Amino acid sequence: APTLETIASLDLNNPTTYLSFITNIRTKVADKTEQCTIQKISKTFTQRYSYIDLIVSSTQKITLAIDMADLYVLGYSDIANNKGRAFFFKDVTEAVANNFFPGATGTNRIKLTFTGSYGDLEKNGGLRKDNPLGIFRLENSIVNIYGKAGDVKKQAKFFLLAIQMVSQAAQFKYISDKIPSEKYEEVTVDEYMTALENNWAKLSTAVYNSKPSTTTATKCQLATSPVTISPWIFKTVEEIKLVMGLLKSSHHHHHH
Amino acid sequence: TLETIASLDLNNPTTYLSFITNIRTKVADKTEQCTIQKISKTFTQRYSYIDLIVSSTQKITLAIDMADLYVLGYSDIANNKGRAFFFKDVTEAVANNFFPGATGTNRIKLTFTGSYGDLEKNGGLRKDNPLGIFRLENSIVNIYGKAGDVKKQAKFFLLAIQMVSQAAQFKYISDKIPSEKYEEVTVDEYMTALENNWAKLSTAVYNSKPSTTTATKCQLATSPVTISPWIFKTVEEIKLVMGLLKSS
Amino acid sequence: APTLETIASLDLNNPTTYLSFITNIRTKVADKTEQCTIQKISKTFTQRYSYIDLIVSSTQKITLAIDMADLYVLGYSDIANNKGRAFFFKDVTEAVANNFFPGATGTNRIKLTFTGSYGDLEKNGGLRKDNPLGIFRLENSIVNIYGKAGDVKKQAKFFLLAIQMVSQAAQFKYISDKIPSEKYEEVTVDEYMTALENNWAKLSTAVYNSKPSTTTATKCQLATSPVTISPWIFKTVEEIKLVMGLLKSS
Amino acid sequence: APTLETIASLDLNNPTTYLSFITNIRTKVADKTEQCTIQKISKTFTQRYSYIDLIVSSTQKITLAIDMADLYVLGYSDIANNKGRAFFFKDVTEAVANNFFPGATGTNRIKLTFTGSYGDLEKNGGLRKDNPLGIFRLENSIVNIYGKAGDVKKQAKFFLLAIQMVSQAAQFKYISDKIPSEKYEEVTVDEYMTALENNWAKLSTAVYNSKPSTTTATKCQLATSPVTISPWIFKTVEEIKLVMGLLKSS
């Protein structure tokens, strides 16, 4: 089992640290060079897989399995009856999953019957608009599965919170910046939020395809304006920067 | 003649962070303190307008002092004539810079100031006046062209100052205004702690010391800086909540 | 349908009567004998089924169909096209529903397409956090459906206000005592309240499992401490007593 | 100074404990015998003066000087410059103040520049409606004055929250039952709350002057109906019982 780094940990009883935690994630995976003054995920990593911890107390945390290449959540790990236990998304290959959680062995390595797509998560845990985000919301979703028998509905509700408040919060300033430091306050996930969440690659490509502008703030101008991802109408790269925390990386192998 | 530095189409709520960003871009110095934007120390013209647009035929214009983002008054239309209201404590020399379309007897001095003590006393506690795009629009509809009603004017000012000025001062506030027009957000003790402590939080950054190991390259002169319930142990933590430092 | 008792009526234009109305519910359904000095719903009724009225005016009210055994809301009755009309949640048996509303006859007894679980009510009417409680909020939601054609969103919003401000309020003093005495003021349903609403059985069971004690005001002590219903962390039965209006019956 | 009991202590970081704290005060001061099934402050005490602690942390608390005869708050103690420091309301005589805080001596025994009347507190600290109640609000108000140089605004703002959320919270279920155990949530002190706060003796007198009843739940009926404490219109003693945690002694 390779040595994996824990690149960020969220102490859910310290809610004001949330943007510091998100910032750590952006800092760990981002390139040194920006793209139109927007951070972008690095194309390569020495070790692309890593952990992110979500802490409920000194003896209870869930550990996310992460692919830093795209900030995908691949599964998570808890502890049950003193044994380490790992749950992996259905579509995650054995070779990838084998990188994670050396304390989960044998029957405690569990392939879930669903993937991390929002289609699958909402099928099992309800529509995104019915799972509000928030610090305690995330904490409570952890309490409801930690050390417990596997429940797809509650696993899905946890995954909805964790993917949106960790992975896509890092990807989108628009998401991370809505989470209140008032631990018990919640944000409804509306169509403006889902629109961004479902169009991460489309927006990143629009930054990559933009042209250099000697007059504009981001020093870039869209190749084609507007970029419509309804209900958003993006007329400038600046307006894209206001929602983006990280661009998806570009390998420059194909044409856009 | 004064510039209109930003305008908010209350019916196109996605544009709100562009509108806040236009305010910050207009008033900020070219350079940052500890990598945080700060208000510019001087201005060719320190007074400007900010429009709050309800429709093609209806808007309220705020009078803004850009040196500190204070709202000094607003202007509407009543009986087909331009009209301006100014807070009690605004000098007539300052108020005179604003609204050439408001002449005659239609320039009015309000009986209260723009302080939260005054506004909350007349319009209700900040926790009882939730923020939101529609809430702001509706409060404008509730006073536009109407006889002066101190309570409804105070509710407008509570919404406008927080959703314009302090929204520009604090990313924490501006970034929680939902793009869903009819969604609102409560002004909780984390918001008011920031709102009450803009100068204190700016002073901590201006008094910080160089650091070679932190991302902002600053460290607090003494830690923590407490604006409860916030406990600020680093300048990066302050930076995450700030949109504009108070000008040195 | 037999003639059922109407055990309480809330005059929605006299908002300071609210806790008298909730007390009237508690008094009707509570057993004579308390558990750890907390009221509990009687195990037996001669007639478990009864009415609770929500009154908008002298001529406009909604009548809730109530199972007093668990304070379940099963449906409601209004008037539409000058005829008594009733709605019943999807999962309510015909035998149970036929106990209610003798003036809602003919074809005016309607099966709803959703149940009263919070999952069903919130997918149709929105999250508890987006449906604040309040006298006017309740009254308004009644006006938005009374005598109207079926509208699942508005009906579900009415049920959220009704179940939380009648049933759940009677069960939890913590909830009932937060309803504002001003008609037009409202209170957000936060995660403390929703934790209670989701865990009435678990909390009541924790009281039932408690051990006798001579030194505590409730004369009870927790079998295991704490009882955690996040965000609530209960270390005494006294702390549970002070949130509980009515224990689930044993 | 005599050695006085600390009859209750609120750990402001365990907000769920709040109603238990209030209950401890009521139990301590309440007579064995009730009046119209309302608790009444005992006519006498062997030692009427006592302490209540308001804990912000293991190292920082403020102790209230309390007169249990009437739940008057007479002052508070903190620590400044490594020494006990006492503050007493301006109208409290030396004889009374001498009962409290033996660890504060010399010039560390300080006469406040105002009394505990709401008129004095509002002059110095703002209207009650502009000073919302709340667990963290109270904690924040303590932090803002503990060990600090005198500040009449923050001292007054502390007393507004302390008197309302301790003394009058025990006097009035209406106040105590509104405080959320979500510690950041606040309650607006509107006309319904100030009306109760201003009329504690009048409401208590209305209870003592009440007549017997064989039917009502309290076994009392008002001597004259209604008892109006605007905006409240009390037609029954059951309605008064809903809002009151303690009667003033007669």
Numbering used by the authors:
A (entry chain B): 1 to 256
B (entry chain A): 3 to 250
C (entry chain C), D (entry chain D): 1 to 250
Per the authors:
Mirabilis antiviral protein (MAP) is the type I ribosome-inactivating protein (RIP), which consists of an RNA N-glycosylase domain with no carbohydrate-binding domain. Ribosome-inactivating proteins (RIPs) are a diverse family of toxic enzymes that catalyze the removal of the specific adenine residues from ribosomal RNA (rRNA N-glycosylase EC 3.2.2.22), thereby irreversibly inhibiting protein synthesis and leading to cell death. Unlike many RIPs, such as ricin or trichosanthin, which inactivate eukaryotic ribosomes, MAP also inactivates the E. coli ribosome by cleaving the N-glycosidic bond at A2660 of 23S ribosomal RNA.
Because of the MAP effect on the E. coli ribosomes, wild-type MAP (wt-MAP) was difficult to produce by the E. coli system. It has been shown that RTA residues E177 and R180 play a crucial role in the hydrolysis of N-glycoside bonds by stabilizing the transition state during the catalysis of the depurination reaction. As these two residues were conserved in MAP, the inactivated recombinant MAP-EQRQ was expressed, purified, and crystallized. Here, we expressed, purified, and crystallized the plural recombinant MAPs, including both E168Q and R171Q mutations (MAP-EQRQ) in E. coli, and determined the crystal structure of MAP-EQRQ at 2.1 Å resolution. As a result, there were four molecules of MAPs in the asymmetric unit, which belong to the C2 space group. There are four molecules (A, B, C, and D) in the asymmetric unit, which are formed by a dimer of dimers. Notably, the active site comprises the conserved amino acid residues in these RIPs, including Y72, Y118, E168, and R171 of MAP. According to the assay, approximately 98% of E. coli ribosomes (0.2 µM) were depurinated by wt-MAP at 0.050 µM, and approximately 90% by the single mutant E168Q at 5 μM, whereas the double mutant MAP-EQRQ, as well as the single R171Q mutant, showed no inhibitory activity even at 5 µM. We impose the MAP structure with TCS/RTA with the eukaryotic stalk to see if there is any difference in these stalk-binding regions; in the stalk-binding region, crystal structures of MAP showed that the peptide binding region is hydrophobic and formed by Y174, Y192, W232, F234, and V243.
